[PDB]
Amino acid sequence: STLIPPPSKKQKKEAQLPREVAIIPKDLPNVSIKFQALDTGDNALRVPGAISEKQLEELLNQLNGTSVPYTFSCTIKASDPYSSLIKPQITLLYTPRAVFKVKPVTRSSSAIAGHGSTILCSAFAPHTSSRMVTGAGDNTARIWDCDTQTPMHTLKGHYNWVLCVSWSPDGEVIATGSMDNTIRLWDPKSGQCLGDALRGHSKWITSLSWEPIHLVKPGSKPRLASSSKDGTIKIWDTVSRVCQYTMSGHTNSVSCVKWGGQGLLYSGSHDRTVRVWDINSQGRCINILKSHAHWVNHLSLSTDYALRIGAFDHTGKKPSTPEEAQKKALENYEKICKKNGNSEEMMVTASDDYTMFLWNPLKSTKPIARMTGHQKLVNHVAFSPDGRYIVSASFDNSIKLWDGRDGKFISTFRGHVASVYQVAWSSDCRLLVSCSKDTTLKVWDVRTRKLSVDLPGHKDEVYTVDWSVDGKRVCSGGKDKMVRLWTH
Amino acid sequence: AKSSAYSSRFQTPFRRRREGKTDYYQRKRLVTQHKAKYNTPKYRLVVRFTNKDIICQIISSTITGDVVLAAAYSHELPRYGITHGLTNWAAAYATGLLIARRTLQKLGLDEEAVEDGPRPFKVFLDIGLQRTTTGARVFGALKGASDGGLYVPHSENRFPGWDFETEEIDPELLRSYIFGGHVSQYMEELADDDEERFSELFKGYLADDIDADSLEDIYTSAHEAIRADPAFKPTEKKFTKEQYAAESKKYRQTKLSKEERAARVAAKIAA
Amino acid sequence: LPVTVEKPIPVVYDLGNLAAFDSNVLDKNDLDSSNARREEKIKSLTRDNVQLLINQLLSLPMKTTTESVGGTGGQSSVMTLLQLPDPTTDLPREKPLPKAKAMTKWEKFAAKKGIKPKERAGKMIYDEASGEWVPKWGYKGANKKLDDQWLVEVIDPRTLNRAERKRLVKKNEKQQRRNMKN
Amino acid sequence: QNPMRDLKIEKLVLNISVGESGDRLTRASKVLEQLSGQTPVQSKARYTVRTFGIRRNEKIAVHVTVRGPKAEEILERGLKVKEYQLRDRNFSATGNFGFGIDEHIDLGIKYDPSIGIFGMDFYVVMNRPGARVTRRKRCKGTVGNSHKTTKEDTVSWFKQKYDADVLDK
Amino acid sequence: ILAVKKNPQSPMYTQLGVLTKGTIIEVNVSELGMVTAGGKVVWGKYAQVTNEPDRDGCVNAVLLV
Amino acid sequence: NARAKRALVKREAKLVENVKQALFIPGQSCNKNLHDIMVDLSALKKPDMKRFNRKNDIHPFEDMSPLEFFSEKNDCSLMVLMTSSKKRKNNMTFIRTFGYKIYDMIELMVADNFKLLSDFKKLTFTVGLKPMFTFQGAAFDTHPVYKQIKSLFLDFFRGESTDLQDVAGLQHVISMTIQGDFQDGEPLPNVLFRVYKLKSYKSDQGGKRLPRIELVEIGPRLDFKIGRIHTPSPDMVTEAHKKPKQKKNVELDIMGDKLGRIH
RNA sequence: GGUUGCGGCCAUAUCUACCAGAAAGCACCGUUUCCCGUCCGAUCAACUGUAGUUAAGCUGGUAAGAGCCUGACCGAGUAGUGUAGUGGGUGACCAUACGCGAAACUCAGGUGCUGCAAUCU
RNA sequence: GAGAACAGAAAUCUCCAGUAGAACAAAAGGGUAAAAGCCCCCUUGAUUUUGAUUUUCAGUGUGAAUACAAACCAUGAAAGU
């Protein structure tokens, strides 16, 4: 193997002297600092010195009147959180932490056997990390008890591949969009065919999406939304199993379907155009956005993390009634979204022209910024759970991290040697896992823009990656027909 | 009889070699393991099987001779709801899970700190004198301790279901040993062709009417109760130690004095 | 409470052994075998030294990695290690240094002229009828073939061949012993 | 007293000696095969003589060990040939006892001309329950003295079942 | 290319560096993105040349896997 | 075939050496107090130690041939011999050999106030960790016998050598102090011996980096007086400090890159 | 104070012969459908803790039973081995010195202590 | 020692007694007994890539030998060897 050059002779003779122990001398020649938030707050003239960076936190708690945690930074010059004077009046910027720590995911649990073909899609339950669903290259899906690393409840009932699986945002049903243009629903605890296979599309199903819980009528259940290679976007209500009303705007294949916080479906297609449907208007497109030069893959919203769980927070509890459920869901959405008091959900687009666009489709029909710098197609893009970081993966082995509010450039994550197929965030928005065309998975620490761990163990490509909601497990799988769970 | 010079010559083994409990060849390889790269402590999970008991202990050696961090005994499984079969595969699994969850709690992980990182807890399997067979219930404790969230290097060649000529595991046969599935197949298979040896074996089952389903249903709830409460509440321990001391100083035998042996010699010489 | 402490003459360090060397002034009438306050002085005059030593050790360069468990070498991503410098005190060895330079008369003959060593590539040769690769020595070596030939075409000649091989083997061993005696 | 320290049997051992490796050895193995239901093994020599017409490592003897019911089954079935006649010797200082007979066909077995006429051996070793104290792997021990088996215990155990004779002291 | 590991029909030609047919050469394979067990990155492997590159210019080789 | 060539080639002279093995030898005049300290000194040397059982009548300062024989046999570079008498009670002999031949020898003598882990308040320490070191007093830098005692205890109680070191292993410190200063001419003052075990608390005067540490006494606790010595000859000293031997204007850069200056 | 798991020293802890053992545990002990191994479910593996058993296993006591060890001014600071002044030598080299510096018989004593964890009429 | 049909002095079978009086790449004052002894299972090895010693006439980036180090490789449940 290739070796780091060995240290010289004078360097060895240097490394033996006494060396540089800091002392924290006195040290309170007091500097007047300016406590100012990120959004709008500048709250007010205090002059401390070299004090505890955990006492600055308590200062802010007692000042803003809550005693919560706060992260800090200064002089957005190298924008780094006595440590402000060891290297070199001075301001101070802060963000809320919402402390819920997620240890990294280092080891590797057992490589679970399973299907007889490759593994195409995988998803984690929103209520517990104990169950998890995978659709694979056979005509079936499977459920895995991650608690004991064992299989359960294989769901036969298709006759072609299963291309997307989704677990409803209430933890009640699972949906499997397949190759034969059927769509089937299944009960977790039983494994029985919940009715017959919904249908109505002429070519395969590309993506699925659910109705966010904070808008569903209490006493009822959420609805579906299905994309298909034919171009239709169909709605479905999961009690009557009837096609409510379709949408047929695009012309080429449609890649992905979303569902916003105000009831606005977004859809990007292979026709290089992003459409903004509507549900209060019976499904007539109200906005068309044409900015890309090639076709579009994997649009993504600003709140698509909060909209995915629906009142099942990181503490694994449950609701007993839709009354408490709807309040919990509204609280979640407001905690994630309300950073100015309005419905400022943004959208990010990823297309085959190496460039992404930063839309706010509500306020206007123009992009706020054009994020550029890749050198091959962008296969996947994602927003942070708190919404202030965009991560993008691409077929040129790189990953890029952008400031998710206006669209600047922050950093690049090198380290893969083949294409990056997709990425995923953790709960506390501090780590990020990614899978690639070569074997290895990689975990990156966003707080410092470095590589934390690099975990091999697969044998062929890897197609899916899913971190849990409470950060306890990470699931992966691909061309070698094995499921793999990684833990701390 | 025996030659007096031979008895003056021959040398004795170690005490625990005499009482054939310890393996002093394995112990060197397992304690003075590496040991030339760094100086890192080295804990070791031990598991032991008596009749009607499963014992697990996280042992750390030392100069004075040993220390114990966390222990677990199968005879606590009723506290979480398992009364029958306190020595089987499912009991081994539950004990492993319990010891792992207990030590994980006590170390302070969920609900010299420079260069901060949790640094998961690494331990090794002290098999003792147990023979290694594919299916033995000393690897079930291993599986349980691992699934509890402890880190113990291992492999799969000794789990039930490993096929030989085709080197790969089978998942379902393994899952049907975590929930007593073998014992339940035995129950449902023997409940028909015999009732003498269904009232002789599983005699304790009938006094509560536990059937061929609720085994799998109670093992899961046992796991849930374990993950909810590993805190190891002790026994109330009635009859404070002084009572036992005064009680068992009665049946305790006793030596004699020297002036006792001094008179018996004259009594003999007189007799 | 203070993590620091001052001493007049600076302690010398050997971080390659985790060793300190203090040379300040003692007091002859403090550590005597009968002074009551003896331990409360020893344990503190050594505790300040240990404080200086931990101060010095907790400021060395650290070496992180990105590997994970199973890594055949050692540490994983969740272990920081201190890069210790080399020791300085000349501590003596236990055996002399190894040197044994005999030329055995082959390294003299081969070096007077230009016989270079051989490349040491492989151990197999190619047999022609049969069609295998037949180790030259290492399994049924091409030597031990006139032994089981089914006819030799001229006392048994195969046994004479064995004897002639053994003679050269024993001569080689004798030559080696002679060289080693020189 | 005898709470549970009875004198139950342990196991029967058979044996056939043939100082050759031939059809004699093959059929000597065959009769054990068909009789004991299990398979018999071969045993080699240990050093040569050259006077008895043999070599070393010639797979001399064949034998089988039988425990449980099929031990006492043959123990009884092979008694009518000796006609209950067992001397004082053929016992041992440890009570292990056995004999050896000829003319196999006197119990069940037919002729099958291509086997011959094969004589056999016997043996029986006895123990009170608790034979694990020596054969186990952990805390391996040695039985006490009150529990040992001498000639008297075993000879009365014999003058319990089938009530054979003493046969010359 | 990175080396001429072995040329048939002589070792002297292996030394001189000749690229006839059947030669075994060592190529830099960082463009293929191969990762080994344990998570290292291969960047050099063996190939065999499969033509007479004196009757054309190209050297054509097949990787040895 | 090779299972003996292995044990033979383990005892060859190597460019980089391995740990020095210690041999514990009770002479003819051994007592129980003197023999309950050998175990506590071999504890802090585990596992690289070997002890002989019965008594061996060797008087080291007359005929050292049995010592050199034991070296060549047991393949141990260190030697601790236990003797007692009226002229020298609780006498211990520390020898280190060079090339299966004697290098230097030194007698030490114990007082009556020794202590044991059967006396102290017991604490914990893992079997095999490398200890720290502290040598207080200035005589270890200048005076001959006081140089020898330091160069002996380092060679004896340091174990492996390593470049990277984990911090969960720093768990006990050995310390040696001269009992008070002295002017030239006076008898050679006593040298003490102490073994401790660290404990560290949050500081708040140095952040999370530097803590405030505390010591606890575990055992043993010994005193030492100087006996007879045997010093190394100049030739052997110059032959025992040898570096194994494994460029102007030429430098190796980072990235590799052999470079040269032209001036 | 007993019992069990893991240990330090490794016969003050062993070889031999009898006696006692309540409760808890350890064991013998009950069975072969499943994973697993043998000539043989004997040892190894699996199950219930179920029908019994305290007889051996286990611990303890006893014995002018064999072995073992401790200490003392037991020898003694002597025999043994080394220098020295002039302490002497036709030749033979020989006595009491300061510093090194022993054992057997003698005497007296003993025949398991100790670390961590859980628990027990 | 004591015993089992042919069976003896030396043939096989079974129980209580080598602290080693056998066999050990091998010679020891001292070692090897849940082995370093005797069986059974799985397996390459003259592997590949640059610093110290020397020598190449295609003075020749490793070109080869050579010493050491690391990645591998075998085995094991593992500790590790």
From Swiss-Prot, chain A:
Pfam families: NLE, WD40. It is found in: Nucleus, Nucleolus. WD repeats lie at residues 114-154, 157-196, 200-246, 249-287, 325-369, 373-412, 415-454, 457-488. GO terms for cellular component: nucleolus. Residues 19-101 are annotated as: Interaction with MDN1. GO terms for biological process: protein-RNA complex remodeling; ribosomal large subunit assembly. InterPro entries: G-protein_beta_WD-40_rep (IPR020472), NLE (IPR012972), WD40/YVTN_repeat-like_dom_sf (IPR015943), WD40_repeat_CS (IPR019775), WD40_repeat_dom_sf (IPR036322), WD40_rpt (IPR001680). Gene3D superfamilies: YVTN repeat-like/Quinoprotein amine dehydrogenase (2.130.10.10). Coiled coil: none annotated. Residues 28-98 are annotated as: Ubiquitin-like (UBL) domain. Keywords: Nucleus, Repeat, Ribosome biogenesis, WD repeat. Involved in ribosome biogenesis. Required for processing and efficient intra-nuclear transport of pre-60S ribosomal subunits. Interacts with the AAA-ATPase Midasin (MDN1/REA1), which is essential for the ATP-dependent dissociation of a group of nonribosomal factors from the pre-60S particle. Associates with the pre-60S ribosomal particle. Interacts (via WD repeats) with uL18 (RPL5). Interacts (via UBL domain) with MDN1 (via VWFA/MIDAS domain). Interacts (via WD repeats) with NSA2. Belongs to the NLE1/RSA4 family. This is Ribosome assembly protein 4. It comes from Saccharomyces cerevisiae (strain ATCC 204508 / S288c) (Baker's yeast).
UniProtKB/Swiss-Prot annotation, chain B:
It is found in: Cytoplasm; Nucleus. There is a cross-link at K143 (Glycyl lysine isopeptide (Lys-Gly) (interchain with G-Cter in ubiquitin)). SUPFAM superfamilies: Translational machinery components (SSF53137). InterPro entries: Rbsml_uL18_euk, Ribosomal_uL18_C_euk. GO terms for cellular component: cytoplasm; cytosol; cytosolic large ribosomal subunit; nucleus. GO terms for biological process: cytoplasmic translation; ribosomal large subunit assembly. PANTHER family: LARGE RIBOSOMAL SUBUNIT PROTEIN UL18 (PTHR23410:SF12), RIBOSOMAL PROTEIN L5-RELATED (PTHR23410). This is Large ribosomal subunit protein uL18. The gene is RPL5.
UniProtKB/Swiss-Prot annotation, chain C:
The keyword Nucleus applies. One of its GO terms (cellular component) is nucleolus. Disruption phenotype: Depletion causes defects in processing of pre- rRNA and assembly of ribosomal subunits. InterPro entries: Ribosom_reg. It is found in: Nucleus. One of its GO terms (biological process) is endonucleolytic cleavage in ITS1 to separate SSU-rRNA from 5.8S rRNA and LSU-rRNA from tricistronic rRNA transcript (SSU-rRNA, 5.8S rRNA, LSU-rRNA). The keyword Nucleus applies. It comes from the Eukaryota. Pfam families: RRS1. Residues 165-182 are annotated as: Disordered. Keywords: Nucleus, Ribosome biogenesis. Required for ribosome biogenesis. Belongs to the RRS1 family. Component of a hexameric 5S RNP precursor complex, composed of 5S RNA, RRS1, RPF2, RPL5, RPL11A/RPL11B and SYO1; this complex acts as a precursor for ribosome assembly. This is Regulator of ribosome biosynthesis. It comes from Saccharomyces cerevisiae (strain ATCC 204508 / S288c) (Baker's yeast). The lineage of its organism: Eukaryota, Fungi, Dikarya, Ascomycota, Saccharomycotina.
Curated annotation (Swiss-Prot), chain D:
The modification N6,N6,N6-trimethyllysine is found at K70. It is found in: Cytoplasm; Nucleus. Signal peptide: none annotated. The keyword Phosphoprotein does not apply. Keywords: Acetylation, Cytoplasm, Methylation, Nucleus, Ribonucleoprotein, Ribosomal protein, RNA-binding, rRNA-binding. Gene3D superfamilies: 3.30.1440.10. It comes from the Eukaryota. Pfam families: Ribosomal_L5, Ribosomal_L5_C. One of its GO terms (biological process) is ribosomal large subunit assembly. InterPro entries: Ribosomal_uL5 (IPR002132), Ribosomal_uL5_C (IPR031309), Ribosomal_uL5_CS (IPR020929), Ribosomal_uL5_dom_sf (IPR022803), Ribosomal_uL5_N (IPR031310). One of its GO terms (cellular component) is cytosol. GO terms for molecular function: RNA binding; rRNA binding; structural constituent of ribosome. N-terminally acetylated by acetyltransferase NatA. Component of the large ribosomal subunit (LSU). Mature yeast ribosomes consist of a small (40S) and a large (60S) subunit. The 40S small subunit contains 1 molecule of ribosomal RNA (18S rRNA) and 33 different proteins (encoded by 57 genes). The large 60S subunit contains 3 rRNA molecules (25S, 5.8S and 5S rRNA) and 46 different proteins (encoded by 81 genes). Component of a hexameric 5S RNP precursor complex, composed of 5S RNA, RRS1, RPF2, RPL5, RPL11A/RPL11B and SYO1; this complex acts as a precursor for ribosome assembly. Belongs to the universal ribosomal protein uL5 family. PANTHER family: 60S RIBOSOMAL PROTEIN L11-RELATED. Present with 39000 molecules/cell in log phase SD medium. There are 2 genes for uL5 in yeast. This is Large ribosomal subunit protein uL5A.
